[PDB]
Design a protein around this ligand. Sequence first.
Ligand code: NAD
Ligand code: NAD
Lengths: 361, 361
Amino acid sequence: QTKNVSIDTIKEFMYQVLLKVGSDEENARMVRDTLIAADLRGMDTHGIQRFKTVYIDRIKKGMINPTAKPSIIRETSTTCVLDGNNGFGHVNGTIGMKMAIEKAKKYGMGMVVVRNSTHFGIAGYYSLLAAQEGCIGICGTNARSSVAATFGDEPILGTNPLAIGIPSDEAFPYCFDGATSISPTGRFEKYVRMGKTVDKSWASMKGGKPIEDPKELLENYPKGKAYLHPLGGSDEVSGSHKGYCLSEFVEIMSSCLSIANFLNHIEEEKEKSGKFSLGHFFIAINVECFRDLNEFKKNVGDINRTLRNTDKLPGHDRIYTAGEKEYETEQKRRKFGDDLPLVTINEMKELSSFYNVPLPF
Amino acid sequence: QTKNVSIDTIKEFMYQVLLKVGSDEENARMVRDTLIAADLRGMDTHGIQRFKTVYIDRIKKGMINPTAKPSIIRETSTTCVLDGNNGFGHVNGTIGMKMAIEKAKKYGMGMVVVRNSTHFGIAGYYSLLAAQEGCIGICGTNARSSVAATFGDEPILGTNPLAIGIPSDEAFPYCFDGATSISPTGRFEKYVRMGKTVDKSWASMKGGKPIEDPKELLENYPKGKAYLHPLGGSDEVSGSHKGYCLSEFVEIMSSCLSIANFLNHIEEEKEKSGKFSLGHFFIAINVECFRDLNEFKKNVGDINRTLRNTDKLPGHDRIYTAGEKEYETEQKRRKFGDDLPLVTINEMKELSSFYNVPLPF
Ligand SMILES: NC(=O)c1ccc[n+]([C@@H]2O[C@H](COP(=O)([O-])OP(=O)(O)OC[C@H]3O[C@@H](n4cnc5c(N)ncnc54)[C@H](O)[C@@H]3O)[C@@H](O)[C@H]2O)c1
Ligand SMILES: NC(=O)c1ccc[n+]([C@@H]2O[C@H](COP(=O)([O-])OP(=O)(O)OC[C@H]3O[C@@H](n4cnc5c(N)ncnc54)[C@H](O)[C@@H]3O)[C@@H](O)[C@H]2O)c1
């Protein structure tokens, strides 16, 4: 069962509750923008449906500093290292990428890395910021161990998403946004909620036995007794080594340049300090340094249009490109609202009650 | 059957034959270095075993200009566009990346893109150049249509490799280097030669029927009647959409910034002009702008060491990291030589005969 709430309601509510729990006002705006962006785009695991447990409960457990802003550790013409000061990933991310964009506009390219940060929601959000300014945007984050290396029998790597935003001449930019593992953990939380079984390729119990029940992974992976597979699965034959290497790429970019916790150290240091401390990276490339922007947008569109025009495999109506599915969901939800599960509705009611933030139900 | 030839013999021979067919001397050096690099690293599809048909025969058919050098079209502080002037990809690539490195050293980051170029051998080579200079190196190329989009029944995308080179405190750098499709076409040429069947996930006949016989793909994909799958296979469930999006990423980076042929236009324009005209991109990120180099090398090593130390799945002795397999092959071949198929030996003899380039057999 599900209840329809408008985007505006969800937007405003998130921002009021973040103020009530003592966020800096601009911080509340940055965080709710990237949270609602997840709901607008159909990443239902990364906005309101996770507002209470992943953000509010964590501010309550002192795991996030809601008034914190990043600090410049080392800055050059085209680069920067930021200490996240245990703030919102969305705060560090928004500032970091805006900063990378600013540097790209002045010099051609920009890269900003972050240490000592927290969960930053959808990777795609920061890449979208870059595409709106006529830059190619590449970004990612590490996360707590959930994914096994190739030939591994133990969670060691985060789901380590990579997002790539590229200006387009269409109504939406190209935007790849996804984990370097086949599945993220949030899809498992989702599949438990609606009581579906998961695909066999996504995860395995210790010893390599495939998982069909989403609960098995979620409970055992923090125990080091279950794990997710990289893109490419578990055999080199299907391409396992590639997703695994790409996962590591993300990890190194996220931790090695900023000196952030990596791999098993994320969870281990949370057991000591109470806080998940993570890294992020943000790259911006100024298109107009290479070619006219509209001429470039046209070329990207031409690639997309060509791709969608190729022969479709029987059984399938259409071919998509990166970010197409998200645009159509965004158009749908913008006008008709978002169908939220009952648990989320009840979480919202509870927050409304606690912080005296009015709700229309 | 196979005949052992030393790396030095292969190295020198390649360079003499390239001089004999009228290459600029420095060009012969750049090309043979990146060709032998393929043989040193165990990419047996991209060095001497392909010397005759992919390079020499093509210079003979006017498809490569062997004295050509790239031309600067548009240059900024951190960026550049090059016209490859129909030269060797290895020439354009080496110059392009060296140029991106040079800019990274001065400003923090560098990006050079190339249009109107040719086959550039192993992507990993250019990334290795960056890692040797203490930069993160990211690079790629587009190629003729061989790969189907997700839900597609037709080859449209190249195998579009992506290589990432990262400085390490180990004896070899981290180096991911591979196609964005599960398999490249060269692995198919290889499997025909030694008469093995290919995995079921790699390719399909028109209509989606898996291919077991490597010959079926090789003959039908240029006809538009067979195709390779992206990393992730053909179903979204296994992650198809990801490899597919990554493939497109490579394509856009390779063609849209430099104005190179893209997708179906590569083959189509070769049918008109006689020449495969391609794009490439090369990114270099100066580590020391962020963190001490050795401290960074140490962190990368720590990631690798942690990864290799995790529990190994029963049936498997060890876990590898990007570029490990290549280093061990390189160490082996450096001292004991390279076991070349009889066809390659015979190709070499023929070139020796034609161009009066001495061989020890
Ligand atoms: N913050 C974190 O630590 C973290 C960790 C993991 C994932 N995430 C987020 O979770 C979200 C979902 O990630 P996911 O791994 O489940 O991705 P996914 O499998 O849902 O794939 C999403 C991407 O693939 C594209 N796509 C989907 N189908 C396609 C098709 N048929 N053709 C072409 N493109 C197609 C979409 O446009 C989008 O770019 C992402 O927004 C990601 O940033 C965050
Ligand atoms: N020039 C072109 O147009 C073109 C096109 C396609 C491919 N290529 C080249 O072909 C070569 C082979 O490509 P491929 O797609 O067959 O790659 P592949 O499947 O052989 O994988 C190679 C990469 O994966 C790593 N690897 C392998 N096993 C691993 C493991 N168990 N754990 C961790 N890492 C592991 C290697 O270190 C290497 O980085 C590459 O050098 C590529 O550049 C070139």
